Amino acid sequence: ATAEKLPNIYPSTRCKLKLLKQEEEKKQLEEIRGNPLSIGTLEEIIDDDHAIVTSPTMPDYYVSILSFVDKELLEPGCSVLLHHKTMSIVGVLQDDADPMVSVMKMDKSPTESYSDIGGLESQIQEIKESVELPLTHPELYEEMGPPKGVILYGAPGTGKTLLAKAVANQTSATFLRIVGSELIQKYLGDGPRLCRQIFKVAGENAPSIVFIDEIDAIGTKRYDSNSGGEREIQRTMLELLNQLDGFDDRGDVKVIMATNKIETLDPALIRPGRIDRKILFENPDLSTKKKILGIHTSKMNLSEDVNLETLVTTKDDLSGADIQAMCTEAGLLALRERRMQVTAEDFKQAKERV
Template sequence: MSDATANTPIENTNNTVDTAEEMDSEIESLKKENEELRVQSESMRAKLLEANMLANNYLEEMEKLKEQLERITSPPLFIATVMETEDDMALIRQHGNNQEVVTQIPAEFKDEIEPGVRVSINAAFSIVSIMRKATDMRAQIMEVINSPDVDYDMIGGLDDVLNEVIESVEMPLTEPELFDKIGIEPPSGVLMYGDPGTGKTLIAKAVASRAHASFIRMSGSDLVQKFIGEGARLVKDVFQMARDKSPCILFIDEIDAVGGMRTHDGTTGSAEVNRTMLQLLSEMDGFEPSGQVKIIAATNRIDLLDPALLRPGRFDRVIEIPIPDEKAREDILKIHTRHMNIADDVDMTKLARMADGLSGADLKIIVKEAGMFVLRRRGEQITMKDMTEAFNKVTTEEEQNTASGMFA
C-alpha cells in the first residue's frame, strides 16, 4: 500500500508533463495555422486590390468606348456664316449649298454672335458652337507673336534712314496723339529699296521691337501660288491676321516678286500674279493710315515695281538704303565685334577703308570668318591678321561668284 501511494505523485507529474507538451504542440500547430491563414489573407487582399484595379481599368475603358461610340454615332455638324442678326434671331448661310435659314440664337452665344461669325450647326440648323475665323495655315506660319529681339543700336551707319522709319512707322503706333495734335495723317506705308545685305529686314525688326508690336514677315514669292485664287486668298488672310494681332507691323520682303509691272503673256501664271497684286492693292487701300497696322516693304529692284504700288496713299515713304560709306562701315564693324575678344592691333578704321563697296551683311561675314580662323588655330584673340585674311577670303569668293554668274 505504501508503494502505490509512493508512485502516485510520479505518475501525476508525468501526466502533467505530457499534457503540457501536448498543449505546447497544439499551440505551435495553432500558430502555424494562424500564420498560414495570415499569408492567405494577405494573398487574398493583394488579389482583391488587383481585381479592384482591373475593375477600374475596365470601367475607364468602357467610358472611353462609350464616348467613342457617341462620337461615331452622333450626326455631323455643318459650317455656316451669320449674315444678319435681329434680337434673338440670326440669318445664317450654310457653306456648300448657300442655303439661308433663320434660326434662334442660343442664350450662351448671344453676346458673341454677330454678322460674319462662323458657327457650327446641326441638321436642324440650330447653332451648336462658334468657330474661329478661317485663316490659311500658310498665313499662320508667317506670324511671329513676340517682338523681335533687335534694337536700333544693332544697326550702324543708317541714322537718317532710321529717323525716317521711326517717324513713319514707330511714332504712329506709340505716340498717335502727336499726329492728332498737328492734324495730319501718318504715312500709310514705307517702301525700302537697296542692294542685298544693306539692313532692310533688320530695320523692320528693330521698329517692331521698339513699338512692342507683333511682327509678321512674308516674302513676295510666298504669295505667288499655283492654283487660281490661292494667292489672293493668302493675301487677304495675312492682312486680316495683321488686323487681329494689332498693333502689328507687316513686313513684305521681295515685293517685286508679286508687285512687278503688270503684263499678260497669255498664260494662267501671269494672270494669277496680276490677281494677287490687285488683291494686295485692295488690302492696302483698306487700311486706315492712323490704324494699328503698319506696312513695310523691301525690294532690290524698285525699277520693276508697278507704278500703282508707288502712288501716294499706298507707300507714302520710299526710302533708299544705301551701301554704307567708310564711317558707316566702321560703325558696323564695331557693332559686330563688341562681344568678341579683339586684340589691340585690330584697326577698325583701316578695315573700313579696305571694305569699300561691301554691305553690312558682307562685313558680318568677314568678322565671323575671322573668328573661325582663330578657332582653327586654337587661339584666344582675333588679330588684325585674322581680319585681313578673312577679308581676302570673302572678297575673293564674291569676285568668283560674280564672274561665274556672268557666264552662267
C-alpha cells in the same frame, strides 16, 4: 516677408476667381445646357432665335441659341454649341483656332532693334518718322495724321532685313514678314486670298507691322495682260494693292517694302500720298561703316592687334553685313585656330574672302 503676403494675395485671388448662389446659378445655367453636346458650324443668321447650321456629317438644323450668350458674338460659317437632339445652338462656341495664313514671319516687337543692327540711323528716321513716330501716337495726333509703309532698299541682312524689325521691335505691333515669291502658286486668285488671309490677320490683330520682301515676281506689270503673261502676277498684286490702296493708317497697321526691283511696280502700287518712303541701304561710308563696325567688331572678341581703321580703310565699301560677315568667318578662322580671342589677321582674311 511681404512676399508671403503677396503669395497668399495671389492665392486669395485664385479662390475668388474659382468662386465663380451664382455658382449654382452658373451651374443652373450649365445645368440648362445638358451634355455632352455637339459641335457644329454656322451658316447664316436671322433674328429668329432659330438658325440652322453646318456639319461634316452635314445635318443642318434650324435651331435657337440657348440664350444668355449671343448670336452677334459669332459670324456665319462658325462652329457652335449644338445639342445632339436638334443640334440646338447651346450658345457661343469657338471655333477658336484659325492658326494659319499663307506664308509669313509671324512675330511682334521682333528681336531686331535699331541699336542691334549697326548704325543706319540716317534712314532710321525715315522708318521711325513714318511709322515709329505715329506709333507713339501722341504727336501724330496734332500732326493731323502718317504715311502708309515704307520701301526698303539695299541689302537684306544688313540694310533691308536688319532695319525691318528695328522699328518693328520699337513700335511693338504685330510684325508680319512675307515674300511675294512666298506667294504663288502660279494659280489665279488666292494670291489675293494669301494677302486676304494676311490682311485678315492684318485687319484682325491691329496694330501690326506688315512686311514685304523681294517682289520680283508677283509685282511685275510687264507691258501686257495677254500673250503668255501670267495674270496672277498682276492678279495678285492688284488685290495686294487693293488692300494696300484701300488702307493707310494713322499709326496702327504699318507696311514695309523690301526689294531691289523698283519700277517693276505700279506707281499707285506706291500710291504717293500713301507710301512716301524709300529706304535704301548703301554701302555704309567708312565712318557709318565704322559705326556698324565698332558694334559688330567689338561684340566679336579679339586681340588688340585688331583695329577698326585697320579694317575700315582696307575696305571696298562693303555691306554692313560684310562687316558682320568678315567678323563672322573671322572668328571661324580663330575657331579653325581654336582660340577664343581673334587676331587681326583673321579679319583681313575673312573680309578678303567675305
